[PDB]
Symmetry: C3
Subunit: 98 residues, 3 copies
């Protein structure tokens, strides 16, 4: 019961700003962005957020809300368990590190 | 039990098309592809979130088509996935897969 | 499964020291990718799937060699890995690592 989760979302590159700015506005700044390819192999954007479990549903809504375009290929959101999180700067561990 | 898993494989870049097409032929199209480095030589990472019962099937496909018989053929990892959500429809569980 | 994935996001200028330090400690199996983090500044992601007993030292190596004393040094995540398969020999479990 770590109560820490990784949110992994694959979205359209043209939806990054709207999804990033919407997340920033909700107080979710800890985010990793990478250029990938998905489903032909079209350029896509992967976003990763390691957060407190209680924040997962809120982030899903924000990602789901902003990323939607109503067309096929909008992307998916994955929830992956995280058993530990550590801050490199102070070696602090746990939910405090998030 | 979640019954949803993430298949994460690091493979040679020259084996991507052959592995991709093999998976598509077997009905596994949902896949994310990213360029990485490993050993620092360039490699290709493929990710598939699938139903648990399909894992063994996909492992076979990747291993059979990514293998060249030399060191560096890559490795396949299975990571638990507790939830999957479809952006277009917000469907969760195996339906979103 | 007693197998775990170590995923660390660090400053790009600390990759070599962390990379070389891990290999010096006997940790050669590692994947490196270029990513962005916060505003959307270049960062480096390093992934290692290892035996659970080795995680702690790897946390130590990454944290001690990636830290600079400034804010934004990065984080280390521990994710469960339920299976590892060697593409070439198709060997699974902790032996495959
Ligand atoms: Cl869709
Ligand atoms: Cl993962």
């Amino acid at each position: 019961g770590s109560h820490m989760k990784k949110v992994e979302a694959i979205i359209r590159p043209e939806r990054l700003d709207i999804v990033k700015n919407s997340l920033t506005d909700a107080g979710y700044v800890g985010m990793t962005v990478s250029e990938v390819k998905g489903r032909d192999l079209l350029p896509k954007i992967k976003i990763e957020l390691v957060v407190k479990e209680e924040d997962v549903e809120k982030i899903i809504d924000i990602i789901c809300e902003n990323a939607k375009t109503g067309n096929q290929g909008d992307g998916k959101v994955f929830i992956i368990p995280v058993e530990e999180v550590v801050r490199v700067r102070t070696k602090e561990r746990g939910r405090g590190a998030i």
